[PDB]
Protein backbone atom coordinates (compact mmCIF):
# COMPACT_ATOMS: atom_id res chain seq x y z
CA UNK A 1 0.00 0.00 0.00
CA UNK A 2 0.88 3.73 -0.39
CA UNK A 3 3.60 5.15 1.93
CA UNK A 4 5.50 8.45 2.36
CA UNK A 5 8.75 8.18 4.45
CA UNK A 6 10.62 11.41 5.46
CA UNK A 7 14.23 12.10 6.67
CA UNK A 8 15.04 12.16 10.42
CA UNK A 9 14.73 15.08 12.90
CA UNK A 10 17.37 17.80 12.38
CA UNK A 11 18.92 20.91 14.02
CA UNK A 12 20.10 23.97 11.99
CA UNK A 13 21.22 27.39 13.27
CA UNK A 14 19.57 30.77 12.55
CA UNK A 15 19.97 31.75 8.85
CA UNK A 16 21.28 28.22 7.96
CA UNK A 17 18.74 26.51 5.50
CA UNK A 18 17.42 22.89 5.82
CA UNK A 19 16.53 20.25 3.18
CA UNK A 20 13.92 17.55 3.99
CA UNK A 21 13.30 14.43 1.84
CA UNK A 22 10.07 12.44 1.21
CA UNK A 23 10.51 8.98 -0.43
CA UNK A 24 7.22 7.69 -2.00
CA UNK A 25 6.16 4.04 -2.71
CA UNK A 26 3.03 1.98 -3.59
CA UNK A 27 1.96 4.14 -6.63
CA UNK A 28 3.17 5.92 -9.86
CA UNK A 29 5.23 8.75 -8.20
CA UNK A 30 5.29 11.09 -11.28
CA UNK A 31 1.42 11.19 -11.76
CA UNK A 32 0.54 13.14 -8.49
CA UNK A 33 1.65 16.38 -6.74
CA UNK A 34 3.56 16.33 -3.43
CA UNK A 35 2.26 18.99 -1.00
CA UNK A 36 4.20 20.31 2.01
CA UNK A 37 2.50 21.27 5.35
CA UNK A 38 4.05 22.48 8.61
CA UNK A 39 3.04 22.71 12.31
CA UNK A 40 5.11 25.35 14.20
CA UNK A 41 5.39 25.12 18.05
CA UNK A 42 1.86 26.14 19.26
CA UNK A 43 0.24 26.59 15.80
CA UNK A 44 -2.13 24.76 13.43
CA UNK A 45 -1.32 22.99 10.12
CA UNK A 46 0.03 25.53 7.57
CA UNK A 47 -0.05 24.60 3.85
CA UNK A 48 3.39 25.60 2.42
CA UNK A 49 3.34 24.51 -1.26
CA UNK A 50 2.80 21.95 -4.03
CA UNK A 51 5.18 20.38 -6.55
CA UNK A 52 4.49 18.32 -9.70
CA UNK A 53 7.13 15.57 -10.08
CA UNK A 54 6.56 15.21 -13.91
CA UNK A 55 7.28 18.88 -14.81
CA UNK A 56 8.91 20.31 -11.61
CA UNK A 57 6.26 23.12 -11.55
CA UNK A 58 5.77 24.60 -8.04
CA UNK A 59 3.26 26.80 -6.19
CA UNK A 60 3.72 28.35 -2.73
CA UNK A 61 1.66 30.14 -0.03
CA UNK A 62 2.46 33.91 0.09
CA UNK A 63 4.04 33.36 3.58
CA UNK A 64 6.62 31.01 1.97
CA UNK A 65 7.48 32.27 -1.59
CA UNK A 66 11.18 33.32 -1.85
CA UNK A 67 11.86 30.99 1.17
CA UNK A 68 11.04 27.49 -0.19
CA UNK A 69 12.41 25.39 -3.07
CA UNK A 70 10.58 22.15 -3.95
CA UNK A 71 12.68 19.67 -6.03
CA UNK A 72 12.50 15.89 -6.80
CA UNK A 73 14.50 12.86 -8.11
CA UNK A 74 12.01 10.69 -10.11
CA UNK A 75 14.51 7.76 -10.40
CA UNK A 76 14.36 7.14 -6.56
CA UNK A 77 10.74 8.56 -6.15
CA UNK A 78 11.97 11.31 -3.76
CA UNK A 79 10.60 14.86 -3.21
CA UNK A 80 12.66 17.55 -1.41
CA UNK A 81 11.79 20.73 0.52
CA UNK A 82 14.56 23.38 1.02
CA UNK A 83 13.84 26.30 3.47
CA UNK A 84 16.25 29.30 3.66
CA UNK A 85 17.06 32.06 6.23
CA UNK A 86 15.93 29.83 9.17
CA UNK A 87 14.45 31.78 12.14
CA UNK A 88 13.30 30.77 15.68
CA UNK A 89 9.70 30.85 14.22
CA UNK A 90 10.54 28.06 11.63
CA UNK A 91 10.95 25.38 14.37
CA UNK A 92 8.16 22.97 13.32
CA UNK A 93 7.10 19.46 12.28
CA UNK A 94 7.26 19.35 8.42
CA UNK A 95 4.92 16.93 6.56
CA UNK A 96 4.81 15.88 2.89
CA UNK A 97 1.35 14.69 1.66
CA UNK A 98 -0.34 13.40 -1.51
CA UNK A 99 -3.87 13.11 -2.93
CA UNK A 100 -5.92 9.90 -3.08
CA UNK A 101 -4.68 7.63 -5.92
CA UNK A 102 -7.59 7.90 -8.43
CA UNK A 103 -7.99 8.81 -12.18
CA UNK A 104 -10.86 11.37 -11.67
CA UNK A 105 -10.45 15.15 -10.96
CA UNK A 106 -11.57 16.77 -7.65
CA UNK A 107 -9.89 14.36 -5.14
CA UNK A 108 -6.93 16.66 -4.18
CA UNK A 109 -7.59 16.27 -0.40
CA UNK A 110 -4.51 14.93 1.45
CA UNK A 111 -5.29 11.19 1.87
CA UNK A 112 -1.57 10.28 2.58
CA UNK A 113 0.90 11.96 5.00
CA UNK A 114 4.62 11.44 5.66
CA UNK A 115 5.47 10.42 9.28
CA UNK A 116 6.68 14.04 9.82
CA UNK A 117 10.12 15.66 10.37
CA UNK A 118 10.92 17.80 13.46
CA UNK A 119 13.21 20.71 12.40
CA UNK A 120 14.77 22.68 15.28
CA UNK A 121 16.33 26.16 14.70
CA UNK A 122 19.07 26.74 17.34
CA UNK A 123 22.87 27.27 17.63
CA UNK A 124 22.95 24.63 20.46
CA UNK A 125 24.99 21.47 19.58
CA UNK A 126 23.45 17.95 19.40
CA UNK A 127 23.65 15.76 22.56
CA UNK A 128 22.46 12.19 23.37
CA UNK A 129 20.52 11.68 26.65
CA UNK A 130 21.59 10.13 29.97
CA UNK A 131 18.87 7.66 31.18
CA UNK A 132 18.40 7.29 34.97
CA UNK A 133 16.08 4.76 36.66
CA UNK A 134 12.92 5.84 38.63
CA UNK A 135 12.83 2.88 41.07
CA UNK A 136 9.60 1.65 42.74
CA UNK A 137 9.40 2.43 46.55
CA UNK A 138 8.06 0.30 49.53
CA UNK A 139 -0.96 -2.92 45.54
CA UNK A 140 -0.01 -0.88 42.44
CA UNK A 141 3.61 0.19 41.85
CA UNK A 142 4.82 3.14 39.73
CA UNK A 143 8.28 3.02 38.05
CA UNK A 144 9.94 4.92 35.20
CA UNK A 145 12.89 6.40 33.32
CA UNK A 146 14.31 9.95 33.53
CA UNK A 147 15.70 10.88 30.05
CA UNK A 148 17.92 13.91 30.77
CA UNK A 149 20.18 16.44 28.94
CA UNK A 150 19.53 15.65 25.23
CA UNK A 151 19.20 17.99 22.19
CA UNK A 152 17.35 18.32 19.98
CA UNK A 153 13.88 16.75 20.34
CA UNK A 154 12.61 14.17 19.93
CA UNK A 155 13.35 10.92 21.85
CA UNK A 156 11.17 7.76 21.73
CA UNK A 157 10.75 5.76 24.97
CA UNK A 158 9.26 2.23 24.79
CA UNK A 159 8.93 -0.44 27.54
CA UNK A 160 10.21 -4.05 27.09
CA UNK A 161 10.65 -3.44 23.29
CA UNK A 162 6.99 -2.34 22.77
CA UNK A 163 5.76 -5.36 24.85
CA UNK A 164 4.34 -3.09 27.65
CA UNK A 165 2.03 -0.15 26.71
CA UNK A 166 -1.12 -0.28 28.95
CA UNK A 167 -0.20 2.01 31.92
CA UNK A 168 2.62 3.93 30.09
CA UNK A 169 2.81 7.76 30.46
CA UNK A 170 5.60 9.55 28.57
CA UNK A 171 5.64 13.27 29.51
CA UNK A 172 6.30 16.04 26.94
CA UNK A 173 9.93 17.29 26.99
CA UNK A 174 10.69 20.42 29.06
CA UNK A 175 13.57 22.71 28.03
CA UNK A 176 15.72 23.31 31.18
CA UNK A 177 17.58 26.65 31.73
CA UNK A 178 20.71 24.63 30.65
CA UNK A 179 19.26 24.71 27.05
CA UNK A 180 18.80 20.86 26.97
CA UNK A 181 15.57 18.77 27.12
CA UNK A 182 14.49 16.37 29.89
CA UNK A 183 11.41 14.09 30.07
CA UNK A 184 10.15 11.15 32.17
CA UNK A 185 8.34 7.95 31.16
CA UNK A 186 6.43 6.07 33.89
CA UNK A 187 4.26 2.93 34.15
CA UNK A 188 1.91 1.60 36.86
CA UNK A 189 2.06 -2.21 37.27
CA UNK A 190 0.88 -4.75 39.86
CA UNK A 191 3.14 -4.75 43.01
CA UNK A 192 3.34 -8.63 42.98
CA UNK A 193 5.28 -8.44 39.59
CA UNK A 194 8.52 -6.68 40.83
CA UNK A 195 9.70 -10.16 42.09
CA UNK A 196 9.24 -12.02 38.72
CA UNK A 197 8.69 -9.46 35.88
CA UNK A 198 11.61 -7.64 34.16
CA UNK A 199 11.04 -3.91 33.36
CA UNK A 200 13.42 -2.28 30.82
CA UNK A 201 12.91 1.13 29.15
CA UNK A 202 14.28 1.61 25.56
CA UNK A 203 15.28 5.23 24.71
CA UNK A 204 16.10 6.05 21.04
CA UNK A 205 17.51 9.54 20.25
CA UNK A 206 17.98 9.47 16.42
CA UNK A 207 19.59 12.96 15.98
CA UNK A 208 22.63 11.55 17.94
CA UNK A 209 22.13 7.86 16.82
CA UNK A 210 21.81 7.02 20.56
CA UNK A 211 20.10 3.84 21.83
CA UNK A 212 20.08 3.36 25.66
CA UNK A 213 18.28 0.59 27.60
CA UNK A 214 17.91 1.04 31.40
CA UNK A 215 16.84 -1.84 33.67
CA UNK A 216 14.49 -0.54 36.42
CA UNK A 217 14.98 -2.62 39.62
CA UNK A 218 13.47 -2.02 43.08
CA UNK A 219 16.18 -0.39 45.31
CA UNK B 1 -8.87 35.05 -2.20
CA UNK B 2 -11.05 32.93 0.22
CA UNK B 3 -10.20 33.18 3.95
CA UNK B 4 -11.23 30.21 6.16
CA UNK B 5 -12.47 30.94 9.74
CA UNK B 6 -12.83 27.97 12.13
CA UNK B 7 -14.77 28.09 15.45
CA UNK B 8 -14.77 27.34 18.24
CA UNK B 9 -10.95 27.20 18.92
CA UNK B 10 -11.64 25.02 22.03
CA UNK B 11 -14.42 22.67 23.15
CA UNK B 12 -15.32 20.46 26.16
CA UNK B 13 -18.01 17.73 26.18
CA UNK B 14 -18.94 14.36 27.77
CA UNK B 15 -18.76 10.80 26.35
CA UNK B 16 -21.80 9.95 24.16
CA UNK B 17 -22.50 13.70 23.64
CA UNK B 18 -22.98 15.56 20.32
CA UNK B 19 -20.60 18.45 19.34
CA UNK B 20 -20.31 20.69 16.22
CA UNK B 21 -17.30 22.52 14.62
CA UNK B 22 -17.81 25.44 12.21
CA UNK B 23 -15.84 26.42 9.05
CA UNK B 24 -16.93 29.71 7.37
CA UNK B 25 -15.39 30.75 4.00
CA UNK B 26 -15.24 34.39 2.78
CA UNK B 27 -16.41 33.07 -0.68
CA UNK B 28 -17.76 29.99 -2.56
CA UNK B 29 -15.23 27.31 -3.70
CA UNK B 30 -17.62 24.55 -4.97
CA UNK B 31 -17.77 22.58 -1.64
CA UNK B 32 -14.25 21.06 -2.03
CA UNK B 33 -13.83 21.05 1.77
CA UNK B 34 -12.13 18.28 3.80
CA UNK B 35 -12.12 17.64 7.58
CA UNK B 36 -8.96 16.21 9.26
CA UNK B 37 -8.42 14.80 12.79
CA UNK B 38 -4.91 15.11 14.36
CA UNK B 39 -4.65 13.06 17.61
CA UNK B 40 -1.82 13.67 20.13
CA UNK B 41 1.56 12.52 18.65
CA UNK B 42 -0.06 11.38 15.32
CA UNK B 43 -0.07 12.54 11.65
CA UNK B 44 -3.33 14.15 10.39
CA UNK B 45 -6.04 11.84 8.98
CA UNK B 46 -8.98 12.80 6.71
CA UNK B 47 -12.52 12.21 8.06
CA UNK B 48 -14.73 14.05 5.53
CA UNK B 49 -14.28 15.23 1.93
CA UNK B 50 -16.58 16.97 -0.63
CA UNK B 51 -18.18 18.79 2.39
CA UNK B 52 -20.36 15.76 3.40
CA UNK B 53 -18.75 12.43 2.32
CA UNK B 54 -17.50 10.17 5.18
CA UNK B 55 -14.04 8.68 4.30
CA UNK B 56 -14.09 4.82 4.21
CA UNK B 57 -13.01 3.23 7.57
CA UNK B 58 -13.92 6.42 9.56
CA UNK B 59 -16.40 5.81 12.46
CA UNK B 60 -20.14 6.51 11.72
CA UNK B 61 -20.41 9.20 14.50
CA UNK B 62 -18.58 11.64 12.11
CA UNK B 63 -20.72 13.73 9.73
CA UNK B 64 -20.18 16.85 7.61
CA UNK B 65 -22.82 19.25 6.32
CA UNK B 66 -23.19 22.71 4.75
CA UNK B 67 -22.31 24.31 1.37
CA UNK B 68 -21.38 27.67 -0.23
CA UNK B 69 -19.51 29.38 2.66
CA UNK B 70 -20.88 27.63 5.83
CA UNK B 71 -19.67 24.11 6.84
CA UNK B 72 -20.07 21.88 9.89
CA UNK B 73 -18.36 18.82 11.40
CA UNK B 74 -20.56 16.88 13.89
CA UNK B 75 -19.53 14.15 16.35
CA UNK B 76 -22.85 12.53 17.43
CA UNK B 77 -21.48 10.20 20.19
CA UNK B 78 -18.12 11.50 21.57
CA UNK B 79 -15.51 8.85 22.55
CA UNK B 80 -12.32 9.29 24.67
CA UNK B 81 -9.95 8.73 21.64
CA UNK B 82 -11.62 11.74 19.80
CA UNK B 83 -9.42 14.01 22.01
CA UNK B 84 -7.62 15.76 19.09
CA UNK B 85 -7.32 18.99 17.06
CA UNK B 86 -9.77 19.17 14.10
CA UNK B 87 -9.02 21.06 10.85
CA UNK B 88 -11.07 22.19 7.82
CA UNK B 89 -9.27 22.51 4.44
CA UNK B 90 -10.18 23.82 0.96
CA UNK B 91 -8.82 21.57 -1.88
CA UNK B 92 -10.65 23.13 -4.90
CA UNK B 93 -7.26 24.69 -5.99
CA UNK B 94 -4.05 26.25 -4.58
CA UNK B 95 -3.62 27.52 -1.99
CA UNK B 96 -4.85 24.46 -0.02
CA UNK B 97 -5.62 26.67 3.06
CA UNK B 98 -6.13 25.05 6.51
CA UNK B 99 -8.49 26.33 9.23
CA UNK B 100 -7.07 27.53 12.59
CA UNK B 101 -8.00 24.17 14.17
CA UNK B 102 -10.42 23.23 16.98
CA UNK B 103 -9.14 21.44 20.09
CA UNK B 104 -11.53 18.95 21.76
CA UNK B 105 -11.37 17.87 25.45
CA UNK B 106 -13.46 15.21 27.25
CA UNK B 107 -15.34 16.42 30.31
CA UNK B 108 -15.53 13.43 32.69
CA UNK B 109 -16.12 12.72 36.38
CA UNK B 110 -13.68 14.23 38.97
CA UNK B 111 -10.71 11.90 39.88
CA UNK B 112 -7.95 12.44 42.50
CA UNK B 113 -4.29 11.88 41.57
CA UNK B 114 -2.24 8.90 42.88
CA UNK B 115 1.07 10.45 44.05
CA UNK B 116 4.49 8.69 43.86
CA UNK B 117 7.93 10.17 44.76
CA UNK B 118 11.28 9.02 43.24
CA UNK B 119 14.70 9.76 44.81
CA UNK B 120 17.70 10.57 42.58
CA UNK B 121 19.59 7.43 41.32
CA UNK B 122 23.13 6.79 42.77
CA UNK B 123 24.09 6.91 39.04
CA UNK B 124 22.99 10.58 38.52
CA UNK B 125 24.76 11.92 41.68
CA UNK B 126 28.18 11.54 39.89
CA UNK B 127 27.14 14.34 37.41
CA UNK B 128 26.82 16.84 40.35
CA UNK B 129 22.99 16.99 39.96
CA UNK B 130 20.07 15.33 41.82
CA UNK B 131 16.60 15.09 40.14
CA UNK B 132 13.77 14.31 42.63
CA UNK B 133 10.56 13.34 40.77
CA UNK B 134 6.90 13.57 41.91
CA UNK B 135 4.33 11.71 39.75
CA UNK B 136 0.64 12.74 39.93
CA UNK B 137 -1.11 9.84 38.08
CA UNK B 138 -4.60 9.61 36.48
CA UNK B 139 -6.42 12.78 37.68
CA UNK B 140 -9.20 15.07 36.33
CA UNK B 141 -9.61 17.97 36.02
CA UNK B 142 -6.28 19.25 34.62
CA UNK B 143 -5.71 21.94 37.34
CA UNK B 144 -3.32 20.57 40.04
CA UNK B 145 -0.57 22.13 42.23
CA UNK B 146 2.75 20.64 43.51
CA UNK B 147 4.80 22.21 46.36
CA UNK B 148 8.29 20.80 47.18
CA UNK B 149 9.70 20.75 50.73
CA UNK B 150 13.34 19.97 51.72
CA UNK B 151 13.48 19.68 55.55
CA UNK B 152 10.09 21.58 55.56
CA UNK B 153 11.60 24.67 53.77
CA UNK B 154 9.19 25.18 50.79
CA UNK B 155 11.12 25.34 47.44
CA UNK B 156 10.86 27.96 44.64
CA UNK B 157 12.63 28.54 41.27
CA UNK B 158 14.27 25.04 41.17
CA UNK B 159 11.53 22.74 39.71
CA UNK B 160 9.59 22.03 36.46
CA UNK B 161 6.20 20.38 35.74
CA UNK B 162 5.05 18.54 32.56
CA UNK B 163 1.44 17.41 31.83
CA UNK B 164 0.44 14.47 29.59
CA UNK B 165 -2.26 14.93 26.92
CA UNK B 166 -5.73 13.68 28.03
CA UNK B 167 -5.51 9.81 27.95
CA UNK B 168 -7.44 8.42 24.92
CA UNK B 169 -9.11 5.71 27.15
CA UNK B 170 -10.02 7.14 30.64
CA UNK B 171 -9.75 10.90 29.74
CA UNK B 172 -7.47 11.60 32.77
CA UNK B 173 -4.21 13.61 33.04
CA UNK B 174 -0.79 12.75 34.52
CA UNK B 175 1.79 15.34 35.69
CA UNK B 176 5.52 15.12 36.58
CA UNK B 177 7.32 17.59 38.90
CA UNK B 178 11.17 17.52 38.83
CA UNK B 179 13.10 19.22 41.68
CA UNK B 180 16.71 19.90 40.53
CA UNK B 181 19.46 20.31 43.20
CA UNK B 182 23.29 20.34 43.39
CA UNK B 183 24.79 17.11 44.80
CA UNK B 184 26.12 19.20 47.78
CA UNK B 185 22.55 20.50 48.51
CA UNK B 186 20.93 17.04 48.01
CA UNK B 187 23.34 15.35 50.55
CA UNK B 188 23.07 18.40 52.93
CA UNK B 189 19.35 17.60 53.72
CA UNK B 190 17.28 14.51 54.79
CA UNK B 191 13.48 14.77 54.16
CA UNK B 192 12.24 15.32 50.55
CA UNK B 193 8.46 15.77 50.10
CA UNK B 194 5.93 16.98 47.49
CA UNK B 195 2.51 18.30 48.52
CA UNK B 196 -0.30 17.96 45.96
CA UNK B 197 -3.49 20.08 45.90
CA UNK B 198 -6.30 19.05 43.47
CA UNK B 199 -10.10 19.51 43.50
CA UNK B 200 -10.61 15.71 44.08
CA UNK B 201 -8.58 15.92 47.37
CA UNK B 202 -10.27 17.11 50.64
CA UNK B 203 -6.84 18.35 51.88
CA UNK B 204 -3.28 18.39 50.39
CA UNK B 205 -1.67 14.90 49.96
CA UNK B 206 2.11 14.72 50.77
CA UNK B 207 4.58 12.01 49.68
CA UNK B 208 8.11 12.02 51.16
CA UNK B 209 11.23 9.87 51.52
CA UNK B 210 14.22 10.02 53.86
CA UNK B 211 17.62 10.30 52.10
CA UNK B 212 19.59 7.05 52.63
CA UNK B 213 16.62 4.73 53.41
C1 LIG C 1 19.10 10.60 -8.39
O1 LIG C 1 19.76 9.90 -7.30
C2 LIG C 1 20.90 9.04 -7.51
C3 LIG C 1 21.53 8.70 -6.14
O2 LIG C 1 20.68 7.85 -5.36
C4 LIG C 1 21.97 9.70 -8.37
O3 LIG C 1 22.88 8.72 -8.90
C5 LIG C 1 21.41 10.48 -9.55
O4 LIG C 1 22.46 11.31 -10.08
C6 LIG C 1 20.20 11.35 -9.18
N1 LIG C 1 19.69 11.93 -10.42
C7 LIG C 1 18.99 13.07 -10.45
C8 LIG C 1 18.56 13.53 -11.82
O5 LIG C 1 18.74 13.69 -9.43
Amino acid sequence: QVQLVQSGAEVQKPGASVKVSCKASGYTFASYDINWVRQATGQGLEWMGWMNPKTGNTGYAQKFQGRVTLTRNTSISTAYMELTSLRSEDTAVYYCATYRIIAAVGYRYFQYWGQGTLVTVSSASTKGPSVFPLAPSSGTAALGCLVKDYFPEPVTVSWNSGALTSGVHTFPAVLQSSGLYSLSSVVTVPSSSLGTQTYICNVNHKPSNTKVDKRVEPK
Amino acid sequence: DIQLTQSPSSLSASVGDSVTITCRASQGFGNYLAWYQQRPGKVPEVLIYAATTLQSGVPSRFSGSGSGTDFTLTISSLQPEDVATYYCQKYNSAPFTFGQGTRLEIKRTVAAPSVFIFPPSDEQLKSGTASVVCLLNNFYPREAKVQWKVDNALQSGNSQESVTEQDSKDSTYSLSSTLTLSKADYEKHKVYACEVTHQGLSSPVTKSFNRGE
Side-chain angles (χ1 to χ4, degrees), chain B residues 42-194:
Chain B
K42 298 274 141 45
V43 309
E45 176 193 297
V46 68
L47 303 164
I48 313 274
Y49 67 84
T52 64
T53 305
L54 190 62
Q55 173 83 328
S56 201
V58 172
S60 55
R61 65 181 179 268
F62 292 96
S63 93
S65 94
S67 75
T69 65
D70 293 290
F71 302 87
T72 271
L73 178 68
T74 300
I75 307 183
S76 74
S77 162
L78 252 195
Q79 303 291 313
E81 56 273 44
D82 300 348
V83 162
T85 309
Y86 294 89
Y87 295 98
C88 68
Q89 197 206 35
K90 91 174 195 59
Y91 65 94
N92 63 300
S93 73
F96 295 120
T97 306
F98 281 95
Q100 297 76 19
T102 294
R103 189 174 48 73
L104 186 44
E105 324 159 6
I106 296 302
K107 180 221 180 48
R108 56 147 287 165
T109 216
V110 162
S114 307
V115 193
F116 310 88
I117 192 170
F118 295 102
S121 54
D122 264 7
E123 209 184 2
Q124 194 191 18
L125 292 178
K126 305 177 224 146
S127 56
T129 298
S131 297
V132 190
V133 177
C134 187
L135 170 59
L136 282 69
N137 211 40
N138 289 19
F139 65 87
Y140 186 86
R142 203 185 118 97
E143 139 263 26
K145 225 122 235 204
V146 178
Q147 169 68 67
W148 282 105
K149 308 193 196 204
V150 178
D151 291 342
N152 297 1
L154 307 196
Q155 299 304 312
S156 153
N158 60 354
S159 66
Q160 274 177 125
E161 289 83 24
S162 187
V163 192
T164 64
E165 305 255 335
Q166 198 164 26
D167 187 68
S168 56
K169 289 181 277 198
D170 61 12
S171 312
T172 60
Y173 297 93
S174 291
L175 180 147
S176 61
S177 184
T178 311
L179 184 67
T180 293
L181 308 172
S182 68
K183 180 175 79 144
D185 279 350
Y186 176 69
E187 284 162 349
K188 257 175 173 260
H189 301 107
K190 171 81 172 227
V191 180
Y192 292 91
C194 57

Side-chain angles (χ1 to χ4, degrees), chain A residues 6 35-37 39 93-96 113-114 116, chain B residues 38 42-44:
Chain A
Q6 305 189 212
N35 284 258
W36 292 88
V37 190
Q39 186 163 48
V93 176
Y94 290 81
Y95 297 93
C96 63
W113 294 70
Chain B
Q38 177 170 53
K42 298 274 141 45
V43 309

Side-chain angles (χ1 to χ4, degrees), chain A residues 123-152:
Chain A
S123 53
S125 66
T126 297
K127 201 165 293 277
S130 319
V131 182
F132 300 118
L134 301 174
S137 103
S138 268
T140 158
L143 56 102
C145 272
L146 181 66
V147 176
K148 190 161 160 60
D149 295 336
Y150 68 86
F151 193 89

Side-chain angles (χ1 to χ4, degrees), chain A residues 72-76 80:
Chain A
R72 84 291 178 192
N73 178 332
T74 305
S75 296
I76 52 164
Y80 304 88

